[PDB]
Amino acid sequence: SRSYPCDEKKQVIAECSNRRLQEVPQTVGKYVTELDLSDNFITHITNESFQGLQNLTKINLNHNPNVGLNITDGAFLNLKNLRELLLEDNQLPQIPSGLPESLTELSLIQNNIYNITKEGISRLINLKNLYLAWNCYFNKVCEKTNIEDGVFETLTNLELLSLSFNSLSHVPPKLPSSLRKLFLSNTQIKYISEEDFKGLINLTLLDLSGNCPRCFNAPFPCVPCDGGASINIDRFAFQNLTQLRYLNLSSTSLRKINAAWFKNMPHLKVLDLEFNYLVGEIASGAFLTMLPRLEILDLSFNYIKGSYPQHINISRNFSKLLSLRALHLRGYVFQELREDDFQPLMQLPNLSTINLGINFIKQIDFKLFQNFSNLEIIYLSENRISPDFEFDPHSNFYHFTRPLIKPQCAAYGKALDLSLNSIFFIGPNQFENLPDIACLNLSANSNAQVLSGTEFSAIPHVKYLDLTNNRLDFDNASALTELSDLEVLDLSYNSHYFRIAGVTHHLEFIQNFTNLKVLNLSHNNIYTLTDKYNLESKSLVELVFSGNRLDILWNDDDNRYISIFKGLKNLTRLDLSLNRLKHIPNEAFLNLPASLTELHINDNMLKFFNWTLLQQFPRLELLDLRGNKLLFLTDSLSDFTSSLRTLLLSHNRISHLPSGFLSEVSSLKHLDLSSNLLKTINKSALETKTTTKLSMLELHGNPFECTCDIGDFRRWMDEHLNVKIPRLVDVICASPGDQRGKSIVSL
Amino acid sequence: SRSYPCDEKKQVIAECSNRRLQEVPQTVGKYVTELDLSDNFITHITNESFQGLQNLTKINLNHNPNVGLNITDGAFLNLKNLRELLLEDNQLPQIPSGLPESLTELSLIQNNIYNITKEGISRLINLKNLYLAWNCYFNKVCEKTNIEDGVFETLTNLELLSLSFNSLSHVPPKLPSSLRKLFLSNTQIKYISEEDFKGLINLTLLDLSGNCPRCFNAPFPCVPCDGGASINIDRFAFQNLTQLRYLNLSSTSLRKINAAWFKNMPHLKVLDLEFNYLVGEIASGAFLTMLPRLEILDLSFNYIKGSYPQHINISRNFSKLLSLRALHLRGYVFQELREDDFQPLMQLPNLSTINLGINFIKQIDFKLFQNFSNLEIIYLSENRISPFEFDPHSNFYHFTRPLIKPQCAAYGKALDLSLNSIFFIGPNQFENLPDIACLNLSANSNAQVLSGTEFSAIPHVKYLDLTNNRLDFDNASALTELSDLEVLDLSYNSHYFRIAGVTHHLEFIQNFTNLKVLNLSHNNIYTLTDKYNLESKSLVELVFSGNRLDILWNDDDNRYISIFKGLKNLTRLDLSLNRLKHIPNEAFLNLPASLTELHINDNMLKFFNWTLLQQFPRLELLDLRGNKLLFLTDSLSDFTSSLRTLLLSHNRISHLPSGFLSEVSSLKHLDLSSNLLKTINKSALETKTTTKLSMLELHGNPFECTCDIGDFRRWMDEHLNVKIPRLVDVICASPGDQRGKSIVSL
Numbered sequence A: 001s002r003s004y005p006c007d008e009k010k011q012v013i014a015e016c017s018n019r020r021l022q023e024v025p026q027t028v029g030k031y032v033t034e035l036d037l038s039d040n041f042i043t044h045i046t047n048e049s050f051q052g053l054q055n056l057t058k059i060n061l062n063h064n065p066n067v068g069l070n071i072t073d074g075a076f077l078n079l080k081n082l083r084e085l086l087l088e089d090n091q092l093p094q095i096p097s098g099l100p101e102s103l104t105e106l107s108l109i110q111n112n113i114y115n116i117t118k119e120g121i122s123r124l125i126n127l128k129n130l131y132l133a134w135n136c137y138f139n140k141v142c143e144k145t146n147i148e149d150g151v152f153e154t155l156t157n158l159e160l161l162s163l164s165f166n167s168l169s170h171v172p173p174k175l176p177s178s179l180r181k182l183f184l185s186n187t188q189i190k191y192i193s194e195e196d197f198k199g200l201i202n203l204t205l206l207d208l209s210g211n212c213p214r215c216f217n218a219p220f221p222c223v224p225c226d227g228g229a230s231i232n233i234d235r236f237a238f239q240n241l242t243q244l245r246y247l248n249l250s251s252t253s254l255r256k257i258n259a260a261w262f263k264n265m266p267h268l269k270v271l272d273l274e275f276n277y278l279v280g281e282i283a284s285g286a287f288l289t290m291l292p293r294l295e296i297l298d299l300s301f302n303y304i305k306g307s308y309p310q311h312i313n314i315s316r317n318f319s320k321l322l323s324l325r326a327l328h329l330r331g332y333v334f335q336e337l338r339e340d341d342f343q344p345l346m347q348l349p350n351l352s353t354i355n356l357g358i359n360f361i362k363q364i365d366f367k368l369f370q371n372f373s374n375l376e377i378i379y380l381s382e383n384r385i386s387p388d389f390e391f392d393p394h395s396n397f398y399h400f401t402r403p404l405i406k407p408q409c410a411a412y413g414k415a416l417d418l419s420l421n422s423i424f425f426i427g428p429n430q431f432e433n434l435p436d437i438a439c440l441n442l443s444a445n446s447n448a449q450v451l452s453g454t455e456f457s458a459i460p461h462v463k464y465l466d467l468t469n470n471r472l473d474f475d476n477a478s479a480l481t482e483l484s485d486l487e488v489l490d491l492s493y494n495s496h497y498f499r500i501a502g503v504t505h506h507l508e509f510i511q512n513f514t515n516l517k518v519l520n521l522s523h524n525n526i527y528t529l530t531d532k533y534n535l536e537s538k539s540l541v542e543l544v545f546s547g548n549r550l551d552i553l554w555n556d557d558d559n560r561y562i563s564i565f566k567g568l569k570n571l572t573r574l575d576l577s578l579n580r581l582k583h584i585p586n587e588a589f590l591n592l593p594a595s596l597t598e599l600h601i602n603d604n605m606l607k608f609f610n611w612t613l614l615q616q617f618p619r620l621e622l623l624d625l626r627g628n629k630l631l632f633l634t635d636s637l638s639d640f641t642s643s644l645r646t647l648l649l650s651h652n653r654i655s656h657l658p659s660g661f662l663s664e665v666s667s668l669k670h671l672d673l674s675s676n677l678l679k680t681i682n683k684s685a686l687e688t689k690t691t692t693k694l695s696m697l698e699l700h701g702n703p704f705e706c707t708c709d710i711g712d713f714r715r716w717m718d719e720h721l722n723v724k725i726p727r728l729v730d731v732i733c734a735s736p737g738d739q740r741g742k743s744i745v746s747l
Numbered sequence B: 001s002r003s004y005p006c007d008e009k010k011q012v013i014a015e016c017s018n019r020r021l022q023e024v025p026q027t028v029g030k031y032v033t034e035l036d037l038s039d040n041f042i043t044h045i046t047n048e049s050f051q052g053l054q055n056l057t058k059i060n061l062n063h064n065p066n067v068g069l070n071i072t073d074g075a076f077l078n079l080k081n082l083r084e085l086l087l088e089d090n091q092l093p094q095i096p097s098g099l100p101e102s103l104t105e106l107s108l109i110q111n112n113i114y115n116i117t118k119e120g121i122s123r124l125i126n127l128k129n130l131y132l133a134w135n136c137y138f139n140k141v142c143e144k145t146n147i148e149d150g151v152f153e154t155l156t157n158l159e160l161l162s163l164s165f166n167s168l169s170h171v172p173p174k175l176p177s178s179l180r181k182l183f184l185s186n187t188q189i190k191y192i193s194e195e196d197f198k199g200l201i202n203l204t205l206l207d208l209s210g211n212c213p214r215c216f217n218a219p220f221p222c223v224p225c226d227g228g229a230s231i232n233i234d235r236f237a238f239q240n241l242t243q244l245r246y247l248n249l250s251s252t253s254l255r256k257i258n259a260a261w262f263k264n265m266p267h268l269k270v271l272d273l274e275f276n277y278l279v280g281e282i283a284s285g286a287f288l289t290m291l292p293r294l295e296i297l298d299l300s301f302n303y304i305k306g307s308y309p310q311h312i313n314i315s316r317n318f319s320k321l322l323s324l325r326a327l328h329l330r331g332y333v334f335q336e337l338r339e340d341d342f343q344p345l346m347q348l349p350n351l352s353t354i355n356l357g358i359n360f361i362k363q364i365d366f367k368l369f370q371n372f373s374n375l376e377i378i379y380l381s382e383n384r385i386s387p388f389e390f391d392p393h394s395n396f397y398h399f400t401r402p403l404i405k406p407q408c409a410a411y412g413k414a415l416d417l418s419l420n421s422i423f424f425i426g427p428n429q430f431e432n433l434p435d436i437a438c439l440n441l442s443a444n445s446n447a448q449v450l451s452g453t454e455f456s457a458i459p460h461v462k463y464l465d466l467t468n469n470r471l472d473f474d475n476a477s478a479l480t481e482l483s484d485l486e487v488l489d490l491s492y493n494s495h496y497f498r499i500a501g502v503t504h505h506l507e508f509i510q511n512f513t514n515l516k517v518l519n520l521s522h523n524n525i526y527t528l529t530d531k532y533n534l535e536s537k538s539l540v541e542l543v544f545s546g547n548r549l550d551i552l553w554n555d556d557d558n559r560y561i562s563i564f565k566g567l568k569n570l571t572r573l574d575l576s577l578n579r580l581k582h583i584p585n586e587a588f589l590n591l592p593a594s595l596t597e598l599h600i601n602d603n604m605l606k607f608f609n610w611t612l613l614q615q616f617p618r619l620e621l622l623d624l625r626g627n628k629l630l631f632l633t634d635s636l637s638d639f640t641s642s643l644r645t646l647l648l649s650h651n652r653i654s655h656l657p658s659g660f661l662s663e664v665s666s667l668k669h670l671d672l673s674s675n676l677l678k679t680i681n682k683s684a685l686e687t688k689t690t691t692k693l694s695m696l697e698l699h700g701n702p703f704e705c706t707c708d709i710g711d712f713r714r715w716m717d718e719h720l721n722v723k724i725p726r727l728v729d730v731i732c733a734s735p736g737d738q739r740g741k742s743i744v745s746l
Ligand SMILES: *[C@@H]1O[C@H](CO)[C@@H](O[C@@H]2O[C@H](CO)[C@@H](O[C@@H]3O[C@H](CO)[C@@H](O)[C@H](O[C@H]4O[C@H](CO)[C@@H](O)[C@H](O)[C@@H]4O)[C@@H]3O)[C@H](O)[C@H]2NC(C)=O)[C@H](O)[C@H]1NC(C)=O
Pocket: A164, A181, A185, A205, A207, A209, A246, A247, A248, A270, A272, A392, A393, A394, A395, A396, A397, A398, A399
């Protein structure tokens, strides 16, 4: 029997999120142990809410009611297997009372709890992770957090405690010595004493960020300490923190770093000192001598307001950071990087990542990077180089954690990211004295030049090149041909010249690469080319041609572009989306590479599609026709293809499934008919001539008529439990009026 | 009666275009004289199609069926008043037989008519305008056009004849002397003889463009004459064309202009010579001495392929163009404009427009423009300055829109430097310019910090377009040297605004005493430095669309709560596309009380507090289209007396409250289209009041066509003063057998 309303999967989880549920489903499968109820409309939780679910080990009740939750005393107490309970964003006025002893994980993030009591927490002695963060913060109308004395001290198995984004004003005493990770960010703690961490000898992480914050240009309501003072850390505060691997002192207004802080911290691996006032400490820094095992150092955004110094002043003591792998120096702000300035970094054996983003750097002596031992990521993006809540409580608050360079680019080798600069022209010597760059990002440099096949000769082994978002003038057939190992080329958003009919446009250079694999020409507004109308490549596997004008290129009165993709003999993935196509001429379609396995023509305006032409494409496995205006399906698809496995047809105008459709089909595993105009599916369309190979049928968003007519399909839904129908709660009757909004499986 | 399926008016014209009609409506008013049936699915036409409509003077049957039209012989013959008949894009294989002699205008553009015959045309002696263009062209499977000899000679009142985009091979002989406009563009005519236009003494326009075309880099299938040869025009071809005002010789592969062509053409006003090979003629040009009344000369796109000369070479004979008003020289392609190179243009008293777009110009000595007597438009867009596809009814060789937005040009002298590379404005960039009122610096990759000194040489700019740069608004004094600024467009400068960690300063807005219109759209603004409020005594319109008010007005942050309050004079505010799910009450109440127009369309609003409309006594238009609203107030008139237009289309309203329509005697226009209404009950309809409602939009709603739809049908029939547009699109979604049917047809 099909699980409803939750999608149950035996990885036994009952994903039942965002299903407009107004209460705990009394139709949940018995063998469920993990129940996700997030983003619904649950307003009440009673001791009868989870009655026939005693086997439950995990409940997620986050964001209920979605867009305030009431939980009776002891509602969860009859669940002896409950290990993880997530009550985030539930506007809880108090910690739920009578929580079960079995809990190992409890999160009350983003509520209105201002009182952490013994009666709520102290019995929960099996707790390992406790998240009480984000209850009182910013300009929210909320109270100072009251933490009863000794509340955490009985929790002798507690490994993680998060109390960040609450007003504590003091580190709570009597913390359990089991603590491994202590999150106290943005807690309004201004003073750290010798006693505050005295017992925490197993502590591997300490986050004291956002205490006495640096509020200038803060993108959130930020209240500094008096006179913008620094956090006051006692000389001996970290004395017993011998196991510390992570320390976050971001935005604590530090001007001085006491080297004695790290005297007994020999395992310190990651040190976050963003958003402080440490330009002076960066230039002298006795503390750097205390971190021989440090791998990550973040000193981003320590700039002096109003300043634009000529050079970055890096202390020679940086040469002591022998284990350093990554240095983040965003937002120091300085005009020029000379080779001399980075001498202290050049003997560090493992320094692979240097991040100098957002420094308004105008000039760089690029040869310096060659003098490092093993740079892998040279990040210079965003400089001036010339020729219900907006903060995710579970993300870093001071920096995006996304990787610096796309992993697909980085995987090829050394990466040089010069995106968002002003290299509007690459001259004859731009890339001299560089390391062997394999991954090069020149995105958004306002480059309008005519690449001529000589500009990258100093770095001929570039394999992934990102030239997106420029204004490149493709007016030379030898462009980029010096890059004989080029595999991935991204030219998206270079529409500036393409859009102008009157200038010449030349793409013939595509053919000269022997190992070009992926070409992105998206959003170039290509509608006209000069002399050579065909794209050709023996190697190319993937062409993204979205956001261009195939409607014009293939207009009925023009034969010139009828074979535009035919010369891509090796092509298997082709993206023709967003080309304003109302139809594709038969000859044009039949001239698509016969080697295609994946074809996207979604988000056009297709009103017509010749299914017969699929005969020409015996390797086609996926056809994406979503977001068009099709009103018609063939009833003889099988005569046209025996290779198609996925057919995406959502968001069209299909109002009728033909007789003998599903069994015809036969090769399809996945058919997506959601968001069309189906009011019914006749017995004839189901038929069951042959045994289907279909494993997923999407049907939500269709205006189903829930009368006698819908019975044949409901009976079809029952027999074929091997055909997954996603979003049953959204597979809804649009009519008659008395049922409008009701899911069809409920009938 | 309620009019259907057409909308009728008095200009008495029945608008019936694009309504999925399968035949000519019979339900059209008896006073209708003009009938627009274009873009329908009409497929047959008989003498019975219009039997009810014998007083029709104009019919438009273009684009039927909207993707063959079959017209019976003499279908229109009983239409005694019929002067205008448009039959464009109807896949006609022939001219319809038995057209009425009353016809004075006939258009057969974009059909498959390869035979122009006496049986079709010759008896239409009242014809004044005959359009036969675009029947065979480009890569269309078609045949050569057979014009039967003398077919037009009986048309002695014919003033306009268009035969463009057909393969004619020769100018048809025996053309009527009455012709004033002759269009023969792209007709594969290689030779023009002395006889071709001999008797056309009233001709004011001759279009011979696209014959022996210049095909290089053509954005269409182009077939040049042999060897890319020039068109061949007899010395005397134009001898009796004394009345000619317009001559279009674009794309005729001309290398040489015979000055003698113009000897008897003393009224020539507009000369179009785009897409030829005239660089040599431009340098020499004896023909220029023959054109003292010429007002517009277009010599665009005459570039020598593969060339990039240092300078443009303008003949001294340009100084003979005494009446010249506009000179278009796009696509000549040259590296540098020097002052001496434009000497021959500088004494021309009426030359107001110079167009040098798309020349790949690297440098200009700007002081030269001062030496002209009367330049008003300096168009230098798209250079390198640093520190069916075609509409048959428009020009084929260039766009026809104004070079400069009229709203900008209206203030005075205009300088358009858009789409160049002025990435930095230094202290001398605008030295020695005329008094610029309108300045376009859009799309110059400019990432500089404006500081209040950059425009000091042209301190009188009134309209300033800085769109689509990467401006770093990091100085409170930016642009404050422009004391007279009235319009400032900073749209699409998101580059720095999107970075939280850099400073952003917008304080400069306050320093302008006559700033009226400010566009800050698509800047992705979500954080500002030090000053969180926009302020101005003068501003009347602010465009803040495409920013992040959802972040700025976040529930946990009171800093931007008065962000627009200081715009004390504002009457128009655009808050569209700010990803707003809800606006905090306090924030909404801090919007300027002077507002008359508020757009919050295309957000994701699920909530709107209708009570807050109380603090906005002058509000006339509220636009909430394209959100996710479900609830409508049931007492709007308690909350507003001024609201005249309320736009709610594309929301999720599924019920109208009992007092609804009756409450608001203020609302003239209510748009409820594309919501989730399945019915409208009698209750929600009226209490009989001083209701000013004149337009109600309801199309796109999933109406349940049962008896529950009955009250509304009755309401419509008993309330004719309320217009409901697109009534054919007011459709039953249910039940199954009724769906797709217009609710009026049940
Ligand atoms: C100060 O620095 C410290 C140390 O660097 C830092 O601690 C880190 O906090 C982040 C953010 O909470 C932790 O990252 C999370 O880790 C848990 C457990 O592995 C994951 O479940 C989380 O993954 C979810 O997060 C995202 C939700 O938006 C999703 O992208 C993702 O798919 C998951 O759903 C998340 O990665 C991180 O573990 C710690 N570091 C350590 C070593 O514990 C702290 O955040 C800094 N202080 C501030 C306020 O920035």
